[PDB]
């Protein structure tokens, strides 16, 4: 996992076009009509992890191997959702434990543009200041009300929960990690998307786009569901289902 | 920006004014 066949080149408000297929685990969750409402990450051939607040139903579809959503020449993979596993400790009030697993009704076919991201150890630690990457088809301006056609990427630092609280107060729980306030910002449409850091040579999913500034302020840290604090749950679900 | 405590609603997103009085909402994609 976490080893793209097409190495991503790095130089979402203030993002930048990603190299096509350089983030192979990035999927798009779309409704019946093809509307993109959230991102997601392939953790293996049968499961996708996304944010719990996306409210995904088996009536939705997972799209893999996609770069330009407006194109019809790409070799994408529309997969069906067999079952949705929402985290029981999720609270739409505190937006904590914002995670949901999606078991596919048909395994994906890994190739050069479709593969899995790695999951961390419940004990794994990622230092503040660490540069990581987030991706997605979220607005590129809060003033756009229209998502970009092509997948965006952005580099951003991780903040310590302590500094992050200077921005959001006590809304920041232990199952949350912040990144940003550096010139970039996730935005409407990025929810469920990944926040990955490269460790020991492979890309690891350390965060899931959750919530942040109502105007995608590039100078306010964004909040992501903290994967290290949720992997045990993820693992048990896979093991039992 | 707001009054710590109140919970508003964007197009299709939930917002909860954090203790620091600022609108922190979900970043889901709204079709409307």
Swiss-Prot record, chain A:
EC number from the UniProt entry: 3.4.21.1
User: Where found?
Assistant: Secreted, Extracellular space
InterPro entries annotated for this entry? Peptidase_S1_PA (IPR009003), Peptidase_S1_PA_chymotrypsin (IPR043504), Peptidase_S1A (IPR001314), Trypsin_dom (IPR001254), TRYPSIN_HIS (IPR018114), TRYPSIN_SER (IPR033116)
Residues that make up the propeptide are 143-144
Q: Which reaction does it catalyse?
A: Preferential cleavage: Tyr-|-Xaa, Trp-|-Xaa, Phe-|-Xaa, Leu-|-Xaa
A GO MF label: serpin family protein binding
Does the record carry Disulfide bond as a key word?
yes
Signal peptide (UniProt feature, chain positions): none
SUPFAM superfamilies from the entry?
Answer: Trypsin-like serine proteases
Kindly list the biological process annotations in GO that this record carries: digestion; proteolysis
Q: What is its main location?
A: secreted
Superkingdom field: Eukaryota
Bridged cysteine pairs (disulfide) = 1-118, 38-54, 132-197, 164-178, 187-216
Q: Name one GO cellular component term.
A: serine protease inhibitor complex
All copies of domain Peptidase S1, residue ranges? 12-239
Q: Which UniProt keywords apply?
A: Digestion, Disulfide bond, Hydrolase, Protease, Secreted, Serine protease, Zymogen
- Catalytic positions are 53, 98, 191
User: Its family?
Assistant: Belongs to the peptidase S1 family.
Q: What is this protein called?
A: Chymotrypsinogen A
Q: Which organism is it from?
A: Bos taurus (Bovine)
UniProtKB/Swiss-Prot annotation, chain B:
Q: Which parts of the sequence are marked as the site Reactive bond?
A: 27-28
User: Which residues belong to any copy of the Pacifastin domain?
Assistant: 1-32
Q: Listed disulfide bonds for this chain?
A: 2-17, 12-30, 15-25
Instruction: Indicate what this protein is called per its UniProt record.
Output: Protease inhibitor LCMI-I
Tell me what organism the protein belongs to: Locusta migratoria
